[PDB]
Amino acid sequence: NHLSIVTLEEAPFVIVEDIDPLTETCVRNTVPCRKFVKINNSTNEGMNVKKCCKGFCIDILKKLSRTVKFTYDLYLVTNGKHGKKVNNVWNGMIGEVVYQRAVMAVGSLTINEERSEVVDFSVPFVETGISVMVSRGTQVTGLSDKKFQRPHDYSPPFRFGTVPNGSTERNIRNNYPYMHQYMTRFNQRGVEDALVSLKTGKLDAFIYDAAVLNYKAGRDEGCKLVTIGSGYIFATTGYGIALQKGSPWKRQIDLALLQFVGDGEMEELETLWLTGICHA
Numbered sequence: 658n659h660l661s662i663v664t665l666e667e668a669p670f671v672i673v674e675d676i677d678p679l680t681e682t683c684v685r686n687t688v689p690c691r692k693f694v695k696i697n698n699s700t701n702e703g704m705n706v707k708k709c710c711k712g713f714c715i716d717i718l719k720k721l722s723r724t725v726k727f728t729y730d731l732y733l734v735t736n737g738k739h740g741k742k743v744n745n746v747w748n749g750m751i752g753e754v755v756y757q758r759a760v761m762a763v764g765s766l767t768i769n770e771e772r773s774e775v776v777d778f779s780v781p782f783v784e785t786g787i788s789v790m791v792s793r794g795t796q797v798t799g800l801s802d803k804k805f806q807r808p809h810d811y812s813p814p815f816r817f818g819t820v821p822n823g824s825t826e827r828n829i830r831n832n833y834p835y836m837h838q839y840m841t842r843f844n845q846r847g848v849e850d851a852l853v854s855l856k857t858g859k860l861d862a863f864i865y866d867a868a869v870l871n872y873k874a875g876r877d878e879g880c881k882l883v884t885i886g887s888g889y890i891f892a893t894t895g896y897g898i899a900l901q902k903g904s905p906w907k908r909q910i911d912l913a914l915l916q917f918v919g920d921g922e923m924e925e926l927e928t929l930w931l932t933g934i935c936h937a
């Protein structure tokens with residue numbers, strides 16, 4: 658009854674480190690996690706590489722394993738990231754669950770309606786949504802600011818973007834086509850790229866998952882970043898653990914999460930991994 662569980666690196670929720678080759682054992686607050694890695698860029702031939710995983714979501718998984726009394730084989734997703742339907746097929750962590758390669762998915766995984774059609778989710782345990790990060794000093798009200806609505810009213814035309822394939826991009830693409838097609842010229846490879854662009858005056862605003870942006874603003878070195886809610890209340894949600902549609906384990910996973918919330922364990926984890934120092 659070893660459970661196959663998929664995850665994905667995104668600090669501080671999931672952080673991946675190398676194993677000690679002397680022992681090949683994960684130690685401290687880490688747990689073993691493997692990744693299938695290709696031999697070359699020609700075919701899908703590959704081998705699994707042992708790594709170690711830690712972070713807020715890993716600590717949640719550890720608590721769940723302890724409380725619900727299961728063991729698991731944790732692996733990192735190799736095709737896609739969080740989850741997107743591409744060419745009519747779900748990839749990422751969502752895909753691993755949909756096609757029953759994983760019983761659960763644990764990480765910075767946003768609950769939404771489209772995903773809920775094909776997987777079940779636990780109760781949310783981290784609040785999230787769409788937020789906007791800017792350099793401290795920049796003034797925006799949220800995504801309805803004229804700077805976002807009419808970017809060519811500004812010099813240079815207002816520069817804002819997100820990271821492709823996340824639920825944030827999907828929420829914009831599905832509802833505001835002009836905004837989406839304007840934004841794509843400012844696509845960011847990841848959060849770290851975007852933060853550098855903001856701090857060096859090469860980008861005006863970065864639109865992304867709120868939980869991660871709140872975290873990054875909270876401990877930016879120099880406290881040079883500000884996050885504000887998009888105001889897209891329709892997108893307010895949370896991270897959840899994804900399970901198979903109709904999973905018999907949602908009941909017990911939820912009970913455990915609710916136990917942790919009630920007894921202060923969740924509060925302790927938030928203090929340990931998420932709380933910031935930068936005043937807003």
Ligand SMILES: CCCc1cnn(O)c1[C@@H](N)C(=O)O
Nearest residue numbers: 739765766767823824825866
């Ligand atoms: C690398 C993109 C991550 C992202 C952007 N928005 N949202 O919601 C996510 C991620 N939390 C997700 O579940 O798709």
